[PDB]
Amino acid sequence: LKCNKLVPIAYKTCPEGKNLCYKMFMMSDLTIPVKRGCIDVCPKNSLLVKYVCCNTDRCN
């Protein structure tokens, strides 16, 4: 399971223990993400940034 990194022009493999992909977006530039990587558990979303998980490749 590989996903894109901070910069969507290149992707790598999701770290050990984390087979899930996650992507966070700030309230401001909701059109352009703030965080993009992999995680293990799906994180709690806030009223500031929204978190999105994905089990697909090159998702985030």
Short mmCIF file of C-alpha atoms in Angstrom, two decimals:
data_model
loop_
_atom_site.label_atom_id
_atom_site.label_comp_id
_atom_site.label_asym_id
_atom_site.label_seq_id
_atom_site.Cartn_x
_atom_site.Cartn_y
_atom_site.Cartn_z
CA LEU A 1 0.00 0.00 0.00
CA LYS A 2 1.65 3.16 -1.27
CA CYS A 3 0.29 6.69 -1.22
CA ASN A 4 1.47 10.14 -2.25
CA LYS A 5 3.50 12.26 0.15
CA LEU A 6 3.22 15.92 1.08
CA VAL A 7 3.99 16.69 -2.54
CA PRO A 8 1.62 14.78 -4.86
CA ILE A 9 4.29 14.56 -7.57
CA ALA A 10 5.91 11.65 -5.78
CA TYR A 11 4.59 8.83 -3.61
CA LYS A 12 6.17 6.28 -1.31
CA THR A 13 5.23 3.28 0.80
CA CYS A 14 3.13 3.70 3.92
CA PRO A 15 5.20 3.17 7.10
CA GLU A 16 5.30 0.08 9.35
CA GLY A 17 2.22 -0.38 11.50
CA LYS A 18 0.37 2.03 9.23
CA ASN A 19 -1.29 0.41 6.25
CA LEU A 20 -4.02 3.02 6.00
CA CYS A 21 -3.74 6.32 4.16
CA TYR A 22 -4.83 9.63 5.64
CA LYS A 23 -5.25 13.17 4.38
CA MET A 24 -5.98 16.34 6.31
CA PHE A 25 -7.30 19.63 4.98
CA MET A 26 -7.39 23.02 6.66
CA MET A 27 -10.51 25.17 6.79
CA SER A 28 -8.69 27.83 4.80
CA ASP A 29 -7.28 26.29 1.64
CA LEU A 30 -9.75 23.42 1.60
CA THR A 31 -8.87 23.11 -2.07
CA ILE A 32 -5.28 22.28 -1.21
CA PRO A 33 -4.43 19.82 1.60
CA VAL A 34 -2.34 20.45 4.74
CA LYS A 35 -1.24 16.93 5.57
CA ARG A 36 -0.83 13.80 3.48
CA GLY A 37 0.58 10.50 4.65
CA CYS A 38 -0.33 7.13 6.12
CA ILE A 39 -1.72 6.15 9.50
CA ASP A 40 -2.94 3.15 11.47
CA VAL A 41 -6.11 4.45 13.07
CA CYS A 42 -8.54 6.95 11.58
CA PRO A 43 -8.00 10.29 13.39
CA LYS A 44 -10.62 12.53 15.03
CA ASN A 45 -11.61 15.48 12.89
CA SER A 46 -11.71 19.02 14.24
CA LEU A 47 -13.55 22.23 13.42
CA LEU A 48 -10.23 23.49 12.10
CA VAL A 49 -9.06 20.71 9.83
CA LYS A 50 -10.81 17.70 8.34
CA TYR A 51 -9.22 14.26 8.30
CA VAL A 52 -9.85 11.65 5.63
CA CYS A 53 -8.68 8.05 5.57
CA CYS A 54 -8.27 5.78 2.58
CA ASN A 55 -7.16 2.19 2.06
CA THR A 56 -6.46 2.83 -1.61
CA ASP A 57 -3.14 3.58 -3.25
CA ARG A 58 -2.11 7.05 -4.36
CA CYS A 59 -5.22 8.19 -2.53
CA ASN A 60 -3.54 10.92 -0.52
#
